Design a protein around this nucleic acid. Structure first.
Ligand SMILES: Nc1ncnc2c1ncn2[C@@H]1O[C@H](COP(=O)(O)OP(=O)(O)O)[C@@H](O)[C@H]1O
Ligand SMILES: Nc1ncnc2c1ncn2[C@@H]1O[C@H](COP(=O)(O)OP(=O)(O)O)[C@@H](O)[C@H]1O
Ligand SMILES: [K+]
Ligand SMILES: [K+]
Ligand SMILES: [K+]
Ligand SMILES: [K+]
Ligand SMILES: [K+]
Ligand SMILES: [K+]
Ligand SMILES: [Mg+2]
Ligand SMILES: [Mg+2]
Ligand SMILES: [Zn+2]
Ligand SMILES: [Zn+2]
Lengths: 531, 531
DNA sequence: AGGGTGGGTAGGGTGGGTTTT
DNA sequence: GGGTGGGTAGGGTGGGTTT
């Protein structure tokens, strides 16, 4: 990836107009990181790819150069729902922009074809779906005449990861986008994406066959976010009492988001928050757009303070004043938590990202990812983040962002960097060998053990048939033992076994593959605990 | 890829039943290459991947091992249309096999669930779509019960390339198949595909979590095939006259296939064969499936001695006695020609694969391949194959199948190996310098040159506005002028320019990027012609 | 929006228990 | 069907091009 330091300057001939346009029509004071760098590249008539997290400010990077240059700027966008969002703010700001898709009516298409060749037109941005390029000979005909007339001057490829079959949401219609610049060379092209893997970019650069393209990446770090992991209470009705105590005590009157695992959690937390005086909402997949668009308005217009949903929020209008993102259960992966929690504090003021870590959540979510090839493995990354108490939460998230994460320091903006004066590391081998005793007795008695059943027999609870006749209880609180077993699960000394039935996939605990290392007398397993 | 030499033996303990089941139940005489090798690996309880060309006989490699083992063998298949084709052959040989999909009737699922646990069941093969694994908790429950009862013993994954997001026709449900051996470890799995690229295969091994896996590839070479390229006549009436004299002269009474470029050509060649006494074929994409299944029966029962089909003549075509594959125009790529022409001579007797090369075809196909990644580059591979007159056609086909093509010799069954003539190299610079003078004069007058307009002005015909006022005609046949210009097009001394209009993609010829090398008086471009 | 000693051969998966198109 | 018949104009579900 190229170095953008040499482009963060305001001495170009267009710098006078870009700074003018930035403040008076877009109503923004300064540039976000790499906004100025990328804008300088497009106005100089060269190719640029921009990697920036969702909500980073990618929309401005091709809207602004259109307003200080002539013609329209063509924006390739994968979805109509996203294109309508862009038109709502562009037409709000007094900028003339329109959109074209397969569903556009007959009367509307005639009006835009008219404006695409009128030199006296005010149209500066024309959004189209990739079908309008590959599967429309007519639109390609009008682009050809507009290019000959110097009316088609810039190209914008939003969500450029769809070019590569390596990147998520690969569209076969998106691979055709290489045809634009080969026949329209004088028009600059810009690519935008949230996916950071470099090899997907280079494949997009080959399909979008300009190899000599500058590639800028913004710092995926959000310094105004505070990350924290709290233990999830065993009793649910006591937990939701603790939620209101935190909302009222910390975030009184400020809007936020609550992420839950399942749809039944999303609704039950909503109505149980409303009864306690917190205006809540649900955003989980089904109902009628009309009856789950109101909740968007009610949250934007602040009739409701929190939106308790399951994961499909996708809610940036930049939602600028989001002060807190509390998770009821952990997200499926680290790339899911960063995306979901990263929607807070878009005003760059201090916002909180709170994750509630529950031992029961590990196995219910693990049971459902068994059809994602790396599902449990991505989940264990999230669980490792939860049980980790000694490292900066920002550094744990950074391990998934190798190419796009800058080394900027936490500066005491995580749970672990303020609290937690120094540690000690203790041996936990005997507890691991103890757990094998209950699992080996279960194999002898043809009994299968749920995670709950394993703790019970360990403590001296549950079926006496499952008890180890001479094994003594560990004399530790149940919250510590739920963190001991999960460590053995992450460390692969214990493994998850799944049983498929008609209703659901239920997770059991069985002896792990690394338990044979305990036959070695010199083997030692350790955990980092508090001294 | 692993070496199957140590496995090409019939002295294993199960070999007594293999020879019996192969000849007495499947009613076939001899194993095809790698059929015996792969079966020996499966019967030893080891996972194996088999790469074999389409129509090579990979289907037998999991049908036979089911008959020598207890219980059924589970076959993962991507399409209902493919499973129905196999079940027809399964029913006629007297082996009980069934299939399951989302459209299966409520009565049918209740019957198969019963057989999946009946120790006295006759069922030996159970075909399912990937939805029955990923999106069916109930079928997974019964697969789970069948595994404990030792009735579920083998796993078959047909079209395994769909697991990888790199391979064509990718299904997201195929990435979930990693659960099969993850939860059914004692059951062996076999993977099958027609795509040979190694990175897709290694991805499939990780997707289904078998890193320890044998990988066999069959020789994509078909020695019984004769490859030939003939020049296409200018008049379409004389071409069909030359086609009929080929069927009558060489291929009297035996069935074959004719592939055409366009849908209009398929129906025009059809009716022109009927009037000349040739039993027609009519294969297209837009007619009712009733018609699609008709042309198969009349072709299978030899009521028609040809199916003059378009691209996608519809493989699961399994007709062994196809003695000729005449192409009316060239295929889109080399990977497409091998697939289309390879459907001849499955009885291992000498069949001909003849391609007709037309100068007008180069640009008609170019207009449809310039809209998708890379194919115009793939199209030039075919044109290079056509104009090549000194190299074995088997070597030209081999260059696209590097990893899976054995160096076994042609033995004089291709167009270039029987011509027995060789030639020196002649200079063609003046003709290239001549063509540039006409292309630059057209650009000065703001006129664009079609391929036809370029030939006319060169010969001294066509519009006088386009003549050079000198540059007296080359006095060579138009057949030479077509192959000289196309050679300059491959060598990039000429390039294709496209104009998009409301009805068509029109290809034009313009000065190429390598024309600047002709400013050097020492530059020489040469062509090989016949001596 | 139930629980798994209530059962999965006659109870079935659109009856319900687990997130995006 | 043909492109000097035209595309600020007639529209592409009217037809000239691959599953
Ligand atoms: N410099 C800025 N100051 C304030 N808001 C900005 C700035 N740049 C962009 N934005 C806003 O960020 C919003 C979302 O950015 P977007 O491009 O949607 O990110 P994604 O896509 O990634 C836009 O509505 C835009 O108004
Ligand atoms: N061992 C064999 N001997 C003779 N013919 C065979 C043998 N195996 C397969 N075939 C024939 O090859 C034809 C196509 O093979 P198929 O299994 O469809 O390949 P795919 O799968 O790829 C079938 O009609 C079948 O009759
Ligand atoms: K039930
Ligand atoms: K027309
Ligand atoms: K029930
Ligand atoms: K019931
Ligand atoms: K017309
Ligand atoms: K007309
Ligand atoms: Mg965006
Ligand atoms: Mg097959
Ligand atoms: Zn920190
Ligand atoms: Zn040869």
């Amino acid at each position: 990836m190229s170095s953008p330091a040499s482009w963060n300057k305001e001495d170009f001939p267009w710098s006078g107009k870009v700074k003018d346009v930035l403040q008076n029509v877009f109503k923004l004071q300064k540039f976000r990181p790499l906004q100025l760098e990328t804008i300088n590249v497009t106005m100089s008539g060269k190719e640029v790819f921009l990697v920036m997290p969702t909500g980073g400010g990618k929309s401005l990077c091709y809207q602004l150069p259109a307003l200080c240059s002539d013609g329209f700027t063509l924006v390739i966008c994968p979805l109509i729902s996203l294109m309508e969002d862009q038109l709502m703010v562009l037409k709000q700001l007094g900028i003339s922009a329109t959109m074209l898709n397969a569903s556009s009516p007959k009367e509307h298409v005639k009006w835009v074809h008219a404006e695409m060749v009128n030199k006296n037109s005010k149209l500066k941005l024309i959004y189209v779906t990739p079908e309008k390029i590959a599967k429309s000979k007519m639109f390609m005909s009008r682009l050809e005449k507009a290019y000959e007339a110097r009316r088609f001057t810039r190209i914008a490829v939003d969500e450029v990861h769809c070019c590569s079959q390596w990147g998520h949401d690969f569209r076969p219609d998106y691979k055709a986008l290489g045809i634009l610049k080969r026949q329209f060379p004088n028009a600059s092209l810009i690519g935008l994406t949230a996916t950071a893997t470099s090899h997907v970019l280079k494949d997009a650069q080959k399909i979008l066959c300009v190899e000599k393209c500058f590639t800028f990446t913004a710092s995926f770090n959000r310094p105004n976010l505070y990350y924290e992991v709290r233990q999830k209470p065993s009793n649910t009705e006591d937990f939701i009492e603790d939620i209101v105590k935190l909302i009222n005590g910390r975030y009184k009157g400020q809007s936020g988001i609550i992420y839950c695992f399942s749809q039944k959690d999303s609704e039950q937390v909503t109505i149980s928050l409303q009864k306690l005086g917190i205006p809540a909402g649900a955003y989980h997949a089904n109902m009628e757009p009309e009856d789950k668009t109101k909740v968007h308005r009610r949250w934007a217009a602040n009739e409701i303070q929190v939106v308790v949903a399951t994961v499909a929020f996708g809610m940036g209008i930049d939602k600028p004043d989001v002060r807190f993102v509390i998770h009821h259960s952990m997200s499926k992966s680290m790339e899911n938590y960063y995306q979901e929690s990263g929607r807070a504090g878009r005003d760059d003021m201090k916002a909180d990202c709170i994750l509630y870590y529950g031992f029961g959540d590990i196995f219910r979510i693990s049971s459902m990812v068994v059809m994602e090839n790396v599902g449990q493995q991505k989940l264990y990354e999230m669980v490792s983040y939860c049980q980790n108490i000694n490292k900066c939460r920002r550094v744990l998230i950074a391990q998934h962002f190798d190419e796009v994460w800058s080394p900027e320091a936490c500066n005491k903006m995580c749970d672990n960097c303020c609290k937690e004066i120094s540690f000690e590391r203790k041996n936990v081998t005997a507890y691991c060998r103890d757990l094998i005793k209950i699992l080996k007795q279960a194999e002898d008695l043809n009994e299968k053990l749920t995670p709950l059943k394993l703790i019970d027999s360990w403590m001296g609870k549950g079926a006496s048939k499952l008890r180890v006749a001479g094994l003594a209880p560990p004399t530790l609180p149940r919250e510590d033992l739920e963190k001991i077993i999960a460590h053995f699960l992450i460390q692969q000394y214990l493994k998850e076994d799944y049983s498929f039935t008609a209703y659901a996939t239920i997770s059991y605990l069985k002896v792990g593959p690394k338990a044979n290392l305990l036959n070695n007398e010199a083997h030692v397993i350790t955990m980092r605990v508090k001294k």
